Symmetry: C2
Subunit: 156 residues, 2 copies
């Protein structure tokens, strides 16, 4: 069906967020693996699967709405140079992405695009879990200090 123009615009924006997140995951996972940080690597990998699914859903919805994927400028990634900077950068991305997603959800709801709204609601639930994980690891880094946090990742 021909979708709402502004919904399709939101979906394109959100798809670009997902792609940026995937890009940043691709680098982080490998950095963590190189440092021996198995648990951080594994969480990054699992969350990347989620983000790919999100991106899949966006493209399918855009195409079903007779729109075409068309990305905004995705910008410069802030990769980070140490584990705290990396996770803090992820948190920044994830908080902005959740803000965008709430805006889109409200808008889709307001114009009776309930299928788009419901899709986005599911994605947001996943993103809130990503945020919770990040915030929790960053709180540990503050409590323990980064070096002590890194040393606690080392497996018996």
């Amino acid at each position: 069906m021909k979708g709402d123009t502004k919904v399709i615009n939101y979906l394109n924006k959100l798809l670009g967020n997902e792609l940026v997140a995937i890009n940043q995951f691709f680098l982080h996972a490998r950095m963590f693996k190189n440092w021996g940080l198995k648990r951080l690597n594994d969480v990054e990998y699992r969350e990347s699967i989620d983000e790919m699914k999100h991106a899949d859903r966006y493209i399918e919805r855009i195409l079903f709405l007779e729109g075409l994927p068309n990305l905004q400028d995705l910008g410069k990634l802030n990769i980070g140079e140490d584990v705290e900077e990396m996770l803090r950068s992820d948190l920044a991305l994830e908080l902005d992405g959740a803000k965008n997603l709430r805006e889109a959800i409200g808008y889709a709801d307001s114009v009776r695009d309930y299928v788009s709204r419901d899709m986005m609601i599911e994605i947001l639930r996943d993103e809130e879990g990503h945020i919770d994980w990040l915030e929790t690891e960053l709180d540990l880094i503050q409590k323990m200090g980064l070096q002590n946090y890194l040393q606690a990742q080392i497996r018996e």
Copy 2:
């Protein structure tokens, strides 16, 4: 070992090219699948595996050289609105990426970073194959006209 600063810079640039290409593949493959274009979908998917491997190699080399992945601004993708525009956009990316890669190969060679040079030489061989495919499909589109080309993709 501590690598050459400018080599690491090149590797970062080339990694960003790979990420852009992967992003564009993620969209194109799904567009093609939605249009029923099985053979184009399949080639895009196979080439995306190559690009991911390339990106893997770059990150590993940067890390082995004691550098850190650090991406340039990757910009706005030109997705295209029809199959010719999509493949032409891919060709543009791939030609620029090959130009960058020859520059880096020459530089790495010149400063005796032969391991980096040899890695890039392998990647370039793959990229030249991507270029050949694109150019060949685009020549068919010119010869046949886009619509007749699209109709010839439809399976008996």
